[PDB]
Design a protein around this ligand. Structure first.
Ligand SMILES: *[B-](O)(O)[C@@H](C)NC(=O)c1c(F)cccc1-c1ccccc1
Ligand SMILES: *[B-](O)(O)[C@@H](C)NC(=O)c1c(F)cccc1-c1ccccc1
Ligand SMILES: [Cl-]
Ligand SMILES: [Cl-]
Ligand SMILES: [Cl-]
Ligand SMILES: [Cl-]
Ligand SMILES: [Cl-]
Ligand SMILES: [Cl-]
Ligand SMILES: [Cl-]
Ligand SMILES: [Cl-]
Ligand SMILES: [Cl-]
Ligand SMILES: [Cl-]
Ligand SMILES: [Cl-]
Ligand SMILES: [Cl-]
Ligand SMILES: [Cl-]
Ligand SMILES: [Cl-]
Ligand SMILES: [Cl-]
Ligand SMILES: [Cl-]
Ligand SMILES: [Cl-]
Ligand SMILES: [Cl-]
Ligand SMILES: [Cl-]
Ligand SMILES: [Cl-]
Ligand SMILES: [Cl-]
Ligand SMILES: [Cl-]
Ligand SMILES: [Cl-]
Ligand SMILES: [Cl-]
Ligand SMILES: [Cl-]
Ligand SMILES: [Cl-]
Ligand SMILES: [Cl-]
Ligand SMILES: [Cl-]
Ligand SMILES: [Cl-]
Ligand SMILES: [Cl-]
Ligand SMILES: [Cl-]
Ligand SMILES: [Cl-]
Ligand SMILES: [Cl-]
Ligand SMILES: [Cl-]
Ligand SMILES: [Cl-]
Ligand SMILES: [Cl-]
Ligand SMILES: [Cl-]
Ligand SMILES: [Cl-]
Ligand SMILES: [Cl-]
Ligand code: NA
Ligand code: NA
Lengths: 466, 466
């Protein structure tokens, strides 16, 4: 009799979401192994009939063999997550009909998946919202694809200034943030905490203009994106992802820039002990340690500022000791309020969460800000109750390689002469950089993005202050 | 043997904060009764020696008599509040030393005090922060003394516009809100939700100019204020109050404008049943029902907007069903962050809370926003656990007498002709009023407060939009 087991060896079942997800993945590994065993070339595997036979063969082999499939799943934690969604899933319902949900809990140092939530109730709806449904990640794309890469390329630091002045897409439409056509200049921290859109637009524009290999970074983390020229890419335009894959992106940032490929199967052995498959770790430095650690600091403030999510307030009430762990994260909300995301990490673990409707109708305005945050606070509390040390008490900290520059608050660059020729001084602040030399001297166009009129307005204001 | 009892007759003690507070109040009632018994005039009671004798006589009479003193205190609820401060009082500590606390829970329909928190731990510090310490109520003065009275006088409604443009006190200092010198025009709701200062300044100025009997309202609720001409009175300047007295103010608003005097003693009987004192209710309509109910609606949004307090987020996590009760309230923060207040009501109950330091040193910036909110969410949860129906599931609702006016969003008054002679139309909204005829036609100076330059700026903007 073949068996699927938890990480510690307890049998899940002989051969709900856990059964089918792990069985499906084991059937794929078995497929690759039987093909290679029988000396079938990848050429011959392009034949549709041959492929179909091998897929069926893999399924029957597990069915009738006596294999032991070891999963990465932690019995107590996964069982805690099930009870949490059973007991607290109703908190998601926001007056737009039953709300669906998916979550993935991943170890930051290995990529192993310790538990997940497939949906509200398998018995009523089988869709797997953790591994199967693909949806836009919205503003949770920003740290990975815009700001993270720009920092990594030495094109901004932690206190760099960006334009949030009104501007239009190529098609002529205003770039909107809810009902605001934008404001003025702002720090990277303010842009992240509020999730403003115009600054991310300008950052990704800067990457395109500089010919940065953005695709290089994203493909190293396993993302598939068809068109890298989309202006709204940092807003989640032109990208769709599963919760499991997107959790792998935040794993990379949390693990000091080092990607480990997500997995739910660690090993498959035959009855006699022959190892027919075993996960092989292939760590990749996607972002520098300086970059990753600088981003951890910015995402810490995203949660603490409580601007786009009530999560920390929800958690501090439920479990004040756990709220004092070093949480960082990012929210996302798509165009018609169709998808809400919240991604969370501590130094040890990352937990991705999505909510939305199977038929893509809109959620309420507050679904992501309040309901999902509350539900996810209950989820993290439940996981901690089942495994008290799992989140850990370590802090994220800046890597030694980070470069610290004294910069003007107003410009985000070093004090100096500028022609408007004028002497620019004032309040200064420490800015973190991931390059060699740190921040440049202040120049006239000091910010990421902005038009001529924007800068006149901006400088009018700075000069008025010396 | 004399005894002090809970409301249901269970003995508290024969003759901690509960013992001494109720004993002190009973000694005062006994003093009045023995004086009148012995035919001593209020004249003779001005003699210091006579007074001293009667005070001592009152104390011994209780000591040696066999009186039964019935208190308003609910044993299960008060005992729940004690355990809550014991277990969760540490949540107040914010890195400025041990934080002290006081709370009072009052029935809105009677003024009876059902339980209270005197401090963190009587055994370590005896000061009674519920009944003895007087402190400025800060911005929690605004609803009672500025906006409530203005609405009551027919000088604003729910969507009236107020100036938050920069302006100075008489002494020449800018009116500040944290680090902001102010912005532009805003609705009453926005002014309340953010707790801006300039709008309250202008409202109280308008009351002074109109010669409104403000002292009439405040003295009907038992407040003692020495100087009504203080410009910062709505910000808590020139007023100090106990938590018990200030809770009585919010009782009045919550009870549809009807004040009932706070009390902890309901009756004192002699051993043979003679009633020597009994609370006599003297209800007073301080604000119209229209006014009170219009204010309830505005204070509901104060909590839901989560701008000055995390309370609703803290509560929704701890106890989602209880968070769905109809909570309204207001925060306060004094000048050097020396005192933080949060006052809460449902239709049945009001709970006042203060935190601060006995020697008046500053709290942290976030003490009121986060720590006190979290602690007070635990406190209300504990009270509900001890007495499941006590908060109630009723909603606050506008009184039938409220007048509803269709008004321009931009001006908060009815559409019409104005000279800048121009035709003013645009988006409209419903505004609630407590007078006969509702909102006036739009006039040039449409807002509460503002200078000539402010209005030019304001009208520039409105006219630019038709
Ligand atoms: B991002 O923060 O998810 C960003 C791209 N989302 C939005 O701008 C957005 C919509 F597309 C639709 C509705 C609301 C919002 C939004 C999200 C977050 C903060 C403000 C507004
Ligand atoms: B009121 O909201 O308590 C108001 C009078 N308080 C303040 O303006 C105030 C201080 F006097 C000192 C420190 C902070 C604040 C404050 C309070 C509430 C919101 C913003 C700023
Ligand atoms: Cl499945
Ligand atoms: Cl499952
Ligand atoms: Cl075979
Ligand atoms: Cl396990
Ligand atoms: Cl443009
Ligand atoms: Cl690219
Ligand atoms: Cl992908
Ligand atoms: Cl491209
Ligand atoms: Cl686009
Ligand atoms: Cl796998
Ligand atoms: Cl075998
Ligand atoms: Cl590195
Ligand atoms: Cl926080
Ligand atoms: Cl659906
Ligand atoms: Cl650090
Ligand atoms: Cl430097
Ligand atoms: Cl460099
Ligand atoms: Cl740029
Ligand atoms: Cl321009
Ligand atoms: Cl006392
Ligand atoms: Cl007590
Ligand atoms: Cl006597
Ligand atoms: Cl009782
Ligand atoms: Cl002035
Ligand atoms: Cl007066
Ligand atoms: Cl008083
Ligand atoms: Cl006066
Ligand atoms: Cl003053
Ligand atoms: Cl009394
Ligand atoms: Cl007697
Ligand atoms: Cl009335
Ligand atoms: Cl709310
Ligand atoms: Cl919050
Ligand atoms: Cl002190
Ligand atoms: Cl109503
Ligand atoms: Cl009307
Ligand atoms: Cl009238
Ligand atoms: Cl006025
Ligand atoms: Cl003027
Ligand atoms: Na968002
Ligand atoms: Na306040």
């Amino acid at each position: 009799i073949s068996e699927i087991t938890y990480s510690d060896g307890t049998v899940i079942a002989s051969i709900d979401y856990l059964y089918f997800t792990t069985l499906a993945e084991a059937q794929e590994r078995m497929y690759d192994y039987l093909a290679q065993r029988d000396n079938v070339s990848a050429k011959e595997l392009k034949n549709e009939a041959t492929q179909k036979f091998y897929r069926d063969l893999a399924a029957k082999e597990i069915e009738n063999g006596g294999y032991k499939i070891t999963t990465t799943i932690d019995q107590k934690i996964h069982s805690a997550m099930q009870s949490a969604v059973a007991d607290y899933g109703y908190l998601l319902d926001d007056g737009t009909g039953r709300v669906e949900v998916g979550n993935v809990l991943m170890d930051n140092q290995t990529g192993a998946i310790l538990g997940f939530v497939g949906g509200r109730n398998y018995q009523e709806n089988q869709n797997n919202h953790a591994f199967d449904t693909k949806r836009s990640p919205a503003s949770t794309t920003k740290p990975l694809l815009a700001y993270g890469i720009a920092i990594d390329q030495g094109l901004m630091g932690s206190e760099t200034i960006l334009s949030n002045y009104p501007t239009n897409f190529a098609n002529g439409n205003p770039i909107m943030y809810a009902n605001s056509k934008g404001t003025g200049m702002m720090t990277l921290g303010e842009a992240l905490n509020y999730s403003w859109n115009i600054p991310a637009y300008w950052t990704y524009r800067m990457l395109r203009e500089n010919g940065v290999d953005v695709k290089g970074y994203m493909e190293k983390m396993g993302y598939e994106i068809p068109e890298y020229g989309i202006e709204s890419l940092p807003m989640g335009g032109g990208i769709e992802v599963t919760v499991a894959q997107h959790t792998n992106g935040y794993q990379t940032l949390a693990n000091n820039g080092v990607y480990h490929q997500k997995h739910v199967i660690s090993k498959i052995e035959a009855a006699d002990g022959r190892v027919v498959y075993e996960y092989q770790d292939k760590p990749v430095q996607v972002y520098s340690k300086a970059t990753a650690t600088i981003m951890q600091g910015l995402l810490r403030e995203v949660l603490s500022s409580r601007v786009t999510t009530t999560f920390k307030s929800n958690l501090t009430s439920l479990n004040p000791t756990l709220a004092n762990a070093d949480w960082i994260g990012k929210t996302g909300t798509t165009g018609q309020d169709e998808n809400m995301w919240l991604m969370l990490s501590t130094p040890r673990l990352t937990l991705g969460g999505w909510i939305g409707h199977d038929d893509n109708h809109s959620l309420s305005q507050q679904a992501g800000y309040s309901n999902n945050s509350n539900y996810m606070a209950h989820l993290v509390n439940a996981i901690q109750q089942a495994s008290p040390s799992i989140w850990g008490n370590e802090r994220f900290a800046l890597d030694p390689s980070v470069v610290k520059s004294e910069v003007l608050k107003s410009t985000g660059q070093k004090p100096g002469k500028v022609s408007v020729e004028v002497e620019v001084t004032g309040s200064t602040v420490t800015s973190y950089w991931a390059n060699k030399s740190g921040a440049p001297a202040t120049s006239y166009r000091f910010a990421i993005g902005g038009s001529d009129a924007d800068y006149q307005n901006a400088w009018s204001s700075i000069v008025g202050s010396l």
